[PDB]
Design an enzyme around this catalytic site. Structure first.
Site, short mmCIF file in Angstrom:
data_model
loop_
_atom_site.label_atom_id
_atom_site.label_comp_id
_atom_site.label_asym_id
_atom_site.label_seq_id
_atom_site.Cartn_x
_atom_site.Cartn_y
_atom_site.Cartn_z
N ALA C 10 0.83 -1.19 0.00
CA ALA C 10 0.00 0.00 0.00
C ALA C 10 0.87 1.24 0.00
CB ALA C 10 -0.94 0.01 1.21
N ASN C 125 10.45 -5.15 -8.66
CA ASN C 125 11.56 -5.20 -9.62
C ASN C 125 12.74 -6.05 -9.12
OD1 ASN C 125 11.87 -3.27 -12.25
ND2 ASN C 125 13.88 -3.88 -11.48
N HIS C 180 14.53 -4.03 -18.06
CA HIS C 180 14.77 -2.60 -17.96
C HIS C 180 16.25 -2.33 -18.19
CE1 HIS C 180 10.77 -1.80 -16.76
NE2 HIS C 180 10.87 -2.22 -15.51
#
EC number: 1.1.1.37
Lengths: 323, 323, 323, 323
Positions: C10, C125, C180
């Site tokens: 959150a 990630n 990425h």
């Protein structure tokens, strides 16, 4: 993965409903019409705009001249009934009611056959009586059927109020129940701009003029189109009802609903459809609000009730004679 | 505070454009039609849906039986021209072209008189020639006039590809320039799903099928409607062009545009309108992209060019014969 | 009634995903976080804007300090995993990888326990490796798990291109696969503006700068925020993936997906997650598109593959050591 | 061109306003903050989501440690002021007020210098007093300045009522004026569900609980977040005010507004800002509605007035010894 809505009738109103539901991404949309090519054409025209609008929906149309095509309704969460006539040269609205009741009987029997699990939104005017006919013909539990009425009258009433007071359409609230025209019953005291009562903003004569314009708002459009009736405002008025069912929104909007049990004590009818404030959700009518009438409202309601009782008895007679 | 869009023509296409602009909140919308009551009726029906849809716009309609009513276009940022006829197999395409050129001449004269600062989006088919006529009649700087073409062909082409490949309409890209029908020129190599060329995804035979359906996409809808032509997909195809001007979006969409100067060396026409990729902004045509043609595309382009040259010469002759 | 999405984490990214899904009305949204009060606070703050925005959704938040609160995930169509930790320099990113792998193990077990039927979108990630860890921990069939990668890189790449060329963001298409940073593999030839190749529109030197900016686009935001990382663009990039599953849109977007069978022959990895173009539907990955690499693309891809193979082996070693 | 909005303050509230304006396509959005990199980062993160969201807007951020960057506000239709001091431990409410008044003076002076034509929406709490400071500092005609208050209190109150009654957020109307907390003055009799008074649906005790929860609604979020305050609901509550100005919607919403002339007879203050129902349009405050108070409301209003008079006196005293 998506909800399914069937729309019966591919004329101006039904196709507007379909285009509106697509824009609002309510669900897959199947359109049905007895006229050769019509539903297929409206569906394709609507679907061909998806790349610009952005809706990833299955939108199809079918000709019901072979009634077997009604099988494509299977799995519909909601069926919107817009099929039916408008006045022909030499037709009273009394003859029209009878004609439309017959169409409702055919449509209701098709719904019973092919998609009896659907909630139904009945549009064909007068939608309270046509909802009643759909109920008698389909056998669907009556909380699962609602008729268009107040959503449309209220949008017109709000439009006029907003223009008169020069305020956003979003902040005007206009309270109506009952039917259209003389059967419509406004509660002026429940109408407001962001909570500020209209009676604190406009004099009686101006409110009266706006009420009158609302009563005959459908006819105002007919007099301008000359050869057809309103479809843009009805289309969205219908869609907001449909999406409240599909997406379980719990909108509170006056609609034609089946009145029974404790609600009969307030609304003075039993086992009939008439326009009252309802909570609309996934089960159809989730709640009927029981209003408190002053004397003017009560006397107006009694007239509306008599009209509905009269026309509902006509539907009764029709079904009694046409097994 | 808001931009103003005038829509000339209140039939199915013009009114759909108006309802579409309102939904997308593009600006205030004034509708015009020579038929008494029609534009006022369409405007009111559209406006009455505002409380449900949420658009806070001024939407008005006017009868142009007397041309003085065109004065109401004053200050329009964009004027959308959808006026014009479709006689069907009674008189030829040639008689029809002439009829419509005359309509564009008088419409363009009214635009020059009442709102010469407007950008114009011409819809009347064939819109390249009708844009040329609007240019000749109005004297508006030609970069400020664009014609509907590729926006509509591409939306159809994308719909067909997306359904064939079962992919989102948002991720299909279909490259077409030129006019409609046999005048359309697809670049299959520039058509893809999220960049993956369609030639890698579908057999050539299937791509050819989809190309042909796109060419005759308007005819497909006409057959289904019987008594009218497409309006939903055209409506949004037109609105995306209009909003790119009003809101200066710099969309890059093939449209009929005026070809001059260095662009003539690429597109082999001079001082005519034809469908080419353009950047659409607040000034109208902000850039014309010069494509490199392969041999197949070049052949197809030359045929489209001859068609435009021929019909544009007909427009010249009409103007020469009528002062 | 409505679809349900759970968001685990959150923080900025998770809460942005939640608010985004609400605005786009994707479904009911439940938010989970180990930190006392955080998920409940984000949920309430988002819900309290519903009257203005218009979303009629159930939005709730729960503290998972007591892991039994994860039971509230039951019935989720999609679960978004954004739980993770920390930064790029200072502590080793190899150390960071191991820490996040551990969190994925715990989160994956909670999902298997309480909502094993969900499709999973993994955001932590590197999302290819973290999707791999979720797969190893949850036992969920691998086509039902996808990782954020290409959606975010492509949106950055599109932004940079659109600004450079002064065109609508809607008409730019930028093709990337892989991871990425240095692991990203652009296909310049599949990147275009409305089908027109970017090589026809920009000098190669400019395209190269834009590719480099995309590779290090995340770091560009960190440099500006100083004490945090990007969350607005990731939030919408994640939401478009989620809504494609929930609403069965069939978007085609590069995401980290499990590569096996015939796909391994194209992509040179087997039984690992890596970023490739996929069709995203109600079943998760509904198609992997097999691209044809030119020599340069293939050479770049081999490098990206080696990085993924190395990190996936580290994940394997971690699971083997803690079984 | 397009409309332009400047947002001063790039923290949670300001950046949420910026992202909200982008999604709603209100206009170009320029963000300003004294902290190096912050506004630039928020603006870029927001812009980079444009290809997915669809907004074709110029979104940029500037660091105002160099005051000259405020020149970039030029041409703004609206300026949103969210800059403020984070309350430090041991700092009283009055000391905080004084610090924030000081920030409004600097901000107001920059607005006077670089964009004096703008309408201003002030957010910094308490926004009535901060609007008054902005007025004193900027010299802007006071009808062109409004402060956030009732939009946020109303949305919370609506959320609570809708959940309690299990109805759509769209149909609940919750009437409040004055400030936040104990300065908030609800009119229960003007609160309703689709026109049906809440006093006909809920007993006094339940209504009182919800009023109280609304009074301390901000504090409820602070207790959950622990380290910050609400921003999602404030963001949209602000954006609906801003877009009513930019798009001249004429929303009727309670906001802090300058009270003078005939309105002073109703609201018992003169030449100060306090929360009252206003019509918001392109000129700022287009109308102040003069309400009729019952005894409870009058007494609660007198308390609210005294708080505003006291805090405004502090602002007057501040300006008097600083110029």
């Amino acid at each position: 993965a998506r909800s399914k809505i069937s729309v019966i009738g591919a004329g101006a109103v039904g196709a507007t409903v379909a285009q509106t539901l697509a824009i609002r991404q309510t669900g897959d949309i199947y359109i049905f019409d007895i006229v050769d090519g019509l539903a297929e054409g409206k569906a394709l025209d609507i679907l061909e705009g998806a790349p610009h609008w952005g809706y990833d929906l299955d939108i199809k149309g079918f000709c019901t001249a072979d009634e077997s095509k009604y099988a494509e309704m299977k799995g519909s969460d909601v069926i919107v009934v817009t099929a039916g006539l408008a006045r022909k040269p030499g037709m009273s609205r009394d003859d029209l009611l009878l004609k439309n009741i017959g169409i409702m009987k055919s449509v209701g029997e098709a719904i019973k056959k092919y998609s009896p699990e659907s909630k139904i939104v009945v549009v064909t005017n007068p939608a309270d009586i046509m909802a009643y006919a759909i109920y008698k013909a389909s056998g669907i539990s009556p909380e699962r059927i609602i008729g268009l009425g107040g959503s449309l009258d209220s949008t017109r009433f709000r439009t006029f109020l907003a223009q008169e007071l020069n305020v956003s359409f979003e902040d005007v609230n206009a309270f109506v129940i009952g039917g259209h025209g003389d059967d419509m019953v406004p509660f002026i005291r429940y109408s407001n701009v962001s909570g500020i009562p209209i009676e604190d903003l406009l004099p009686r004569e101006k409110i009266d003029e706006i009420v009158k314009r609302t009563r005959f708002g459908g006819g105002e459009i007919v007099n301008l189109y000359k050869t057809g009736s309103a479809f843009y405002a009805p289309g969205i008025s219908i869609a907001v009802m449909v999406e409240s069912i599909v997406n379980d929104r719990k909108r509170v909007i006056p609609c034609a609903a089946y009145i029974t049990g404790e609600h009969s004590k307030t609304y003075l009818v039993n086992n009939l459809f008439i326009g009252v404030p309802i909570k609309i959700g996934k089960n159809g009518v989730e709640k009927i609000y029981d209003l408190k009438f002053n004397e003017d409202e009560l006397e107006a309601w009694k007239k509306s009730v008599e009209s509905v009782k009269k026309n509902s008895a006509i539907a009764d007679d029709y079904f009694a004679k046409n097994q």
